Amino acid sequence: SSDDWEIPDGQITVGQRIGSGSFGTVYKGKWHGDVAVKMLNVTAPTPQQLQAFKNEVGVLRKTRHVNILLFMGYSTKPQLAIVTQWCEGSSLYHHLHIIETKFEMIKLIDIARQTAQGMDYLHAKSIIHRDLKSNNIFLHEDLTVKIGDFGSGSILWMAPEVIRMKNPYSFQSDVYAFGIVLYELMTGQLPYSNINNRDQIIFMVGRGYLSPDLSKVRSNCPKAMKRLMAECLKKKRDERPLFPQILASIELLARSL
């Protein structure tokens, strides 16, 4: 009846520092092979740091799905640490905007389908991601989407009610962020690339004066995908579909290719 989440003491090792994440540092490590380890640098955590760790473990431990980054376990001795699978590859952001990988339409639609599958799973478990974006979508072996929270470089994916600010976060604000990921996949670009001012973007998206230019979608982008993108991006949160409907739309347009 137990999940045995707590990793035995003196087993995890960490190597290369790969980044920063929420409460600490992310390393490539070893625990029954390659793993990613998010570890608190200090030995004595503040009650807040400990609470942030417990909340993150509580969310991750409820997930078991191929499209969610695999949570493996946690340790509190000698330091607070969360262990996940190690993914070989790059995030969708890195692919589209750094190394500019050119995916075929069938593969772009499949990345969208798998992300919607993972998001539908999280929402069914009442988990609102709050920071869905292409950098939080990992292409494991550059084939399987793994949603995680790897990391303000998140305004482009922010729903207008989240920009405006209370609790503006909902399943619908995650749907909007997914709409932006759909825009990235179908255009190969980040929205608002011709606006060099962050304050203006924040202000205008929040007022509904500015929205992504859907005419930028590739020519081989199906019409139903463009319509789905438009629905996910609705300025009013109540007008946006939820992931079971988004999933059904993607599955159908993928069969019609």
Ligand SMILES: Cc1ccc(NC(=O)c2cccc(C(F)(F)F)c2)cc1-c1ccc2c(c1)[nH]c(=O)n2C
């Ligand atoms: C090691 C580690 C521990 C915890 C998390 N925590 C999440 O992923 C997360 C937190 C809350 C909710 C959710 C979700 F999505 F379920 F809602 C996910 C991420 C990492 C992690 C893994 C790989 C990484 C990395 C960090 N940074 C990096 O560059 N690589 C390549």
